[PDB]
Amino acid sequence: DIVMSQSPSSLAVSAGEKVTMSCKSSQSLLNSRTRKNYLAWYQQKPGQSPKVLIYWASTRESGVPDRFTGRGSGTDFTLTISSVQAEDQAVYYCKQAYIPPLTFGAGTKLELKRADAAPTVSIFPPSSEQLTSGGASVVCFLNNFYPKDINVKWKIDGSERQNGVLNSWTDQDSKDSTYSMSSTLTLTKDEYERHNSYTCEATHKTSTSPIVKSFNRNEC
Amino acid sequence: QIQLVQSGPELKKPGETVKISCKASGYTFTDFSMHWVNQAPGKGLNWMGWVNTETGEPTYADDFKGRFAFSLETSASTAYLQINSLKNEDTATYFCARFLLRQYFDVWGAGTTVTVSSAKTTPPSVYPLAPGSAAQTNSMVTLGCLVKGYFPEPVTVTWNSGSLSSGVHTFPAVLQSDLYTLSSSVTVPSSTWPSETVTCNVAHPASSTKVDKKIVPR
């Protein structure tokens, strides 16, 4: 089997910059008679299926902007994006189709670097609809921040709480290049009704002081 | 136009069989080889093999020789992929793609994801996340939707049937105790809500359910 090696594993660049990706094969993609390298590059965004960008190693697929350029021949190939934009955030794969089985590289994740941005935080008490089921979740949204590293702390009447907390992060935004995260604290209606103040503290680099958000049950 | 429509998401128990279709349209089905590619959760693409659409001859990559089978229905311009004796490790999304003589994939299906598990299918509870009676005035107002306790993935969340696409943050689901929890937020200008109605639309294929929760001020 022909082995495809891609590197870096991932890259982060500022808008408008030129980024270079590498892909090397086990062997030689170059057919002697056709004078072709059967190496293609595909782009894949979150949740989407792949979309080809380059084929015979260099030939840009129709509809793809000239910003993308494939080079190389033999075992060394590269993909380049001259003026990187947010709509390029995705994983890029090279695939060899010289000799079956068709093999893919491990892929190279490409993210954007931008100015720092602090999380805009929102907190939501349990919906009354959920309360009638004897459940209680407090949701906290920490949206559009950057860089992507972020920590959240939950407090109930000033006391930190670690149990019943679920966290989820979003892929780099296709528009503003920021990141978001969702944290949910779940308790039984009973526990929830025995405490009064619920709050979530976000800790980002964009500040030494945790952004705090809360509400008190005695005020809803 | 040229399309590849795949069947929906499947939830199978270990040891069972699954068969998914890939219906082509917009081109003559028998002129291009139809291949299959899989992708395990967050793991990258892997070629499974192809089926010659005129001779109907399948060709499998070693790793998929055995429980996997490629078949057709030329009359319906449809390609099939059947997995037998399902393993937990088969969980992944399978794509069908059209291949050209220039040796690359022209068009792809949205992919079909199949989950191998013994957990019971259970519909999501959808709760409206309206701002708590308080804090005034923000220029922008952030609403949300909490989709909890469902299985298996996925659920598709949209706002106002899709007309409200910007400012949306729908988060990856998190698995806990055979039950999933997902969340989604939309931030819109205060002058538009409660003014205009903002509604969360969530669909859960496995249980055949759609819930349209309207967000109403507390």
């Binding site: 993609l29 056709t34 189709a97 010289y98 000799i99 068709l102 | 002129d31 003589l101």
Partner: peptide, 16 residues
């Protein structure tokens, strides 16, 4: 070739 749908450039020959 004796074949329309081919997989693997190693087999393709100039068009001619």
């Amino acid at each position: 070739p004796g074949g329309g749908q081919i997989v693997g450039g190693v087999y393709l020959l100039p068009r001619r």
